[PDB]
Amino acid sequence: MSTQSNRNALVVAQLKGDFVAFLFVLWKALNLPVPTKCQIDMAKVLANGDNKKFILQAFRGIGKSFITCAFVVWSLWRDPQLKILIVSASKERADANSIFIKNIIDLLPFLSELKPRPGQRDSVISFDVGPANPDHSPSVKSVGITGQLTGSRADIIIADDVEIPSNSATMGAREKLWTLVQEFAALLKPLPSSRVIYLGTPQTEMTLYKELEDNRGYTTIIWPALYPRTREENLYYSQRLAMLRAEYDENPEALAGTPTDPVRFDRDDLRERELEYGKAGFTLQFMLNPNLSDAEKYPLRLRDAIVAALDLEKAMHYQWLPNRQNIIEDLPNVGLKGDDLHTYHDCSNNSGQYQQKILVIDPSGRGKDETGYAVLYTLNGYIYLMEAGGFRDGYSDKTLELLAKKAKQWGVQTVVYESNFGDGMFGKVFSPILLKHHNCAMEEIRARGMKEMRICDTLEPVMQTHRLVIRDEV
């Protein structure tokens, strides 16, 4: 039984965390820690099974340390007779983190508890020093670069409040070899958990903004905000209000302090994917649309190559079809179809086709959503309209498969580049207005309350398509 249970905890962190990690209460004695949805999400994200490198952009006044401690415990307690854990922090701050990890360890049952060799010996700063084997060492990040290089067979690095470590660039550079091509690859094959976990609240457009952006440009992990603490979701009268805790917290303080403390927003910038510095320069071309939702910016020309992207409307929002002049070095948007009048799942393929045909048999890349897959078939070369210029990443998927997060991520990342470096020129008014509100929805981007992102999202498909080798001359 013991072997099965130990192994169970070993590869199911959530179960281990919910069952064995305790706090010792004064009224109820040793009780189970009541994990929160954000903490549970964070535990899953930090595991050998999933990735290796994780970065959290969290707000302040979230009991993050409670989870970080449970993870670090779980790591050392279930390591394959191996592994050194070190943290980078300017304080005593890293000592506080390991204290909590020790608070977790000390409450474990015998069978899950490895024997303790060292434990804050000499009033440090360290547990399980020397072979035993796993260890956790609290370190100042200000010293290390020294801490990173000096470590012998490092397995995990946790970096507390990474955004508030001054002169981090050298310490960060020291980290690169430890993770990036890389003893990390070699240790991961051995099943060496560890790994790099960074968690902290933002601090302007410093080094961390670069870390978060590079991560978010590729993935959408991870960020929780004041709302993650569900106790705040109930007012003084003990009724759910999703509203007053925020009002009360805004008062007895400041709005500038509330974004600083409970929002994890970066200072010197809005959320928007496209910088306002660029959204201000963007001019449009006003045009009167057809009976359908077509806006013609520049008419089709013979011997010009066009590309079309289509983000169909599942139900809420609109169908968005951009047509982009691909001929020259600078891609211009020459025509857009924007409509929510399509009550029929059914008459769009023909309507879209005449614009695709109008633009020199324009190849089209359709977002494969419920309606998408759909419209795919009707305008397929084989399905109904026999249109031979429908782009597909596979034969099962007659367009852009939206499975796996990455396509949208890099599609947004390439979007940003294309629009900002002025490789792609947008003419549609409603286009740029959607960009105005297509901002951070950590860990991705979306349209804020009461706005649509249909136009922007179908340009995201173009952005993703932009990366593709086949696109390098459709």
Place this chain on the structure above:
Amino acid sequence: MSTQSNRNALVVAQLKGDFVAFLFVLWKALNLPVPTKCQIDMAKVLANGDNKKFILQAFRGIGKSFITCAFVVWSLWRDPQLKILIVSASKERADANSIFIKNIIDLLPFLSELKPRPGQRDSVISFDVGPANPDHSPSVKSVGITGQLTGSRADIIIADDVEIPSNSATMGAREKLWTLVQEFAALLKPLPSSRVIYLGTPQTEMTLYKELEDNRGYTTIIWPALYPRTREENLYYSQRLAMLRAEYDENPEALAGTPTDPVRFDRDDLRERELEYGKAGFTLQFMLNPNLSDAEKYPLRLRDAIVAALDLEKAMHYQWLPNRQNIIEDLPNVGLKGDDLHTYHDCSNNSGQYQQKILVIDPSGRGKDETGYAVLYTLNGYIYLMEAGGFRDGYSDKTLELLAKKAKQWGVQTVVYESNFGDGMFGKVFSPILLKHHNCAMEEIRARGMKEMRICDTLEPVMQTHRLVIRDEV
């Protein structure tokens, strides 16, 4: 037992040499010869398992004969009922060599000792004459060309003090057929050990300089110097000083005599790979580098092909990125990145990429060292930055595999040619200054004490790449 031990000695020369080769001392009787690290290295290098043709550039006052004798013994004693051994030498000198080989043979136990048919009979100059079968014949090299041609079923040729044999060109030409395409190939298949071993101290830029250079241009074998005699490493007070033996030896004589006797340096030349005759003509273009370590000599031009080589810094030294204009018949160096500020294993790939992209999507050949393999991945077409112009010799190795000595050897050899024949033009000041000190580190080249070779070593990658067929139009 005897069969196993005999066979053991047969294919483990070091073991045979350490266990059975003796000297007979006056105070301790028959004792084992105490092999030295240089002698051990030399024994390994002369074996059927390894090569066939070996050349040693040794200093004088090294007991080389002690090893040469042990090898020649081992050859004849463990030949497959075969093999004639002859040496080329102007003396009685070759007679002295075989005397020592006889001194080794005579001390062997019965089971390792083959029966002696002839043994200095008629006051020669020969042992084991006629079928028996193996034999060793002391010969003057001055006569042979006669000695080489006249031999019947020669198996090994050892050439004593090859650098001091006058009118060797004819004797050398006689040797060519015996080794080079070649009865040697045919005898090696039979398991015929032998083979050609040349050992001697240098004597200016004669025929031997050509032999050593041709060998060193391809391989890095073999050379030991006064320091190989570890007794010299301890002073009068019997304390290790790695310093005074050399001082004492420089005194009671001359510095010109010490390079002549204990250094194995060639007279009419410095160590440098590039001749000073060429290093004097080399002009540079002074430029102010970027925030990074980029020096731009000539800006990128449309429709010009560029090549980039990158030797990453493991820890000590610098990261070196040359960019070479490959368009014309004469390759010019148009830009160099030289930095040791990269504390991050981690931000280099992006920085390098912008220069590669700046130079018309410049393909790059990265040295696969710990950091290399690394930077490889991040700028890989698949790994992180998705750069599609990263040269690789394999799919596992995303650049220049530094395994096996040969790449560096021929890379240096091609370097030398490119720079001297003026096919490659170097503009960087620090480039040519590194060449100034990139000299003989037998059997290769490196940077002498307190100098860097990062810039030169990354040009070596270009030189090796220069040979590659794929390079003949990247």
